[PDB]
Write a protein that binds this ligand. Structure first.
Ligand SMILES: [Zn+2]
Length: 174
């Protein structure tokens, strides 16, 4: 049961890539899906069973069909946990017709090895693991938030937090 959009206050409270936002237990997942049978399109928001597993259950039980290809993009407030990463990498291993890109606002909560191995496993199976930049936050603000046509005001330190998280992710996936 995915909702169409979230409240702007919720979006700013959960998608901040700052330090305080690491105390946020909730996890949110925006998604865009291109269904190519040769073509339909979907998009929506899941929240936390974590949000990744929710998307897998809904998508597998309600959308999936052979002779159909899927281009899926996730915008997650948290990087997937090792269990979710194993389940998603397993799912992709068994569904070659599904191509997944994961863009995350925050990495792991602490410097755990099994989180790094989860991300690396996701990448070995063909999933694109990336950090959310300003363009990604703006896109989410336009397409998954009741923005009331107000423009996206980024928070302080967004870009430097991106550069740090992207250097870290480069060190994880190399
Ligand atoms: Zn998880």
């Amino acid at each position: 049961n995915p909702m169409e959009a979230m409240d702007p206050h919720i979006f700013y409270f959960h998608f901040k890539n700052l330090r305080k936002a690491y105390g946020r237990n909730e996890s949110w997942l925006c998604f865009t899906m291109e269904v190519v049978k040769h073509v339909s399109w979907k998009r929506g928001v899941f929240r936390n069973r974590h949000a990744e597993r929710c998307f897998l259950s809904w998508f597998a039980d309600d959308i999936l069909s052979p002779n159909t290809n899927y281009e899926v993009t996730w915008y997650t407030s948290w990087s997937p946990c090792p269990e979710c990463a194993g389940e998603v990498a397993e799912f992709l291993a068994r569904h070659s017709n599904v191509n997944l890109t994961i863009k995350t606002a925050r990495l792991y909560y602490f410097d755990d090895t099994d989180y790094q191995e989860g991300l690396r496993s996701l990448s070995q199976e063909g999933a694109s693991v990336e950090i959310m930049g300003y363009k990604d936050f703006k896109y989410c603000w336009e397409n998954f938030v009741y923005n009331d046509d107000e423009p996206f005001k980024p928070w302080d330190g967004l870009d430097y937090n991106f550069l740090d998280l992207d250097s870290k992710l480069q060190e994880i996936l190399e």
